[PDB]
């Protein structure tokens, strides 16, 4: 009786890049029409990998495409045809994802980035969107471009910020990373600080001798090299051998050594340290004898 018609049409449609394309339609007419699926005109055959055509009870017929890449971002075009007529139909798949940027999870928390001073250092940041979005570096409010200072790289996947040079105490700051396309726009700061490893702290005096025990007192040294300190190590050597050994930490520009042995010579010297890490240690206190 009736001709081919598509009681349900073909919808245009927009896919995350890689995922899988889906296009259907229903199709009516008596007899039954004859579906076929073309991509930019040509006539599609069915491999059941990158493409695979279906049909459903009810007229119903499908074409899905496989990882949809940008090869597939063209036009298709659907036809019915029966001995009484020939109707056909068109779509076109796109890939469109806003511009998204995702810091590693060390830096999404408001926490800087402690750069020891002439440490070359790489900040890689990696971006999602399709098309694939512009990338943009800038230090406060100044455009960063690529030289002899700065060295940024920016694939078609994730930039990196890098100081190919050591970083530099004037490199601290805040570097804002931008990525857009035409369906979003994603910002980012990342904070970078740049200091060095404390001064050896100084004049280590030793007090309170005993038997076993000992007290030791010091002064901070003439900068932190930039980071604030953190704590002081304190290290003993028995002038017996040369070989110094870690004994404890204290915030505080003294501190108290036990399970000395006694009636022994012994040295002590003390290191500072900052987040940046630690100072070169102090020149040794005078030697001194335990007691009993």
């Given at each position: ?7 349900e049409?073909?919808?245009?449609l ?26 930019q ?38 036809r ?5 007529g ?31 001073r ?24 100044d ?35 931008c ?45 932190d ?68």
């Amino acid at each position: 009786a009736m001709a081919p018609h598509f009681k349900e049409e073909l919808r245009n449609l927009n896919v995350r890049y890689q995922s899988n394309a889906t296009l259907v339609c229903k199709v009516t007419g008596h007899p039954k029409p004859i579906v076929k699926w073309y991509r930019q005109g040509k006539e599609i055959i069915a491999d059941g990998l990158k493409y695979r055509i279906q049909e459903f009870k009810g007229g119903y017929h499908q074409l899905i495409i496989a990882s949809v890449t940008d090869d597939d971002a063209t036009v298709y075009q659907v036809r019915a045809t029966n001995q009484g007529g020939s109707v056909s139909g068109t779509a076109s798949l796109e890939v469109e994802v806003p511009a998204k940027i995702h810091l590693p999870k060390t830096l999404e928390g408001m926490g800087a980035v402690h750069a020891l001073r002439g440490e070359v250092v790489s900040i890689k940041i990696p971006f999602s969107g399709k098309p694939d979005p512009v990338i943009t570096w800038q230090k406060g409010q100044d455009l960063i471009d690529n030289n002899g200072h700065y060295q940024v790289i920016v694939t078609r996947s994730f930039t990196s910020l890098v100081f190919p040079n050591g970083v530099e105490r004037k490199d601290a700051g805040f570097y804002v990373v931008c990525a857009k396309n035409r369906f979003g726009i994603d910002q980012k700061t990342v904070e970078l600080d740049v200091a060095d490893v404390p001064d050896p702290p100084r004049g280590v005096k030793v007090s309170d001798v005993s038997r076993d025990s000992v007290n030791l007192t010091w002064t901070e040294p003439a900068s932190d090299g930039g980071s604030k300190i953190t704590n002081y190590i304190v290290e003993k050597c028995a002038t017996t051998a040369e070989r110094w050994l870690r004994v404890g930490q204290a915030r505080e520009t003294r501190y108290t050594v036990i399970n000395l042995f006694g009636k022994t010579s012994y040295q002590f010297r003390v290191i500072a340290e900052n987040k940046f890490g630690l100072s070169k240690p102090s020149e040794p206190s005078e030697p001194t004898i335990t007691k009993e």
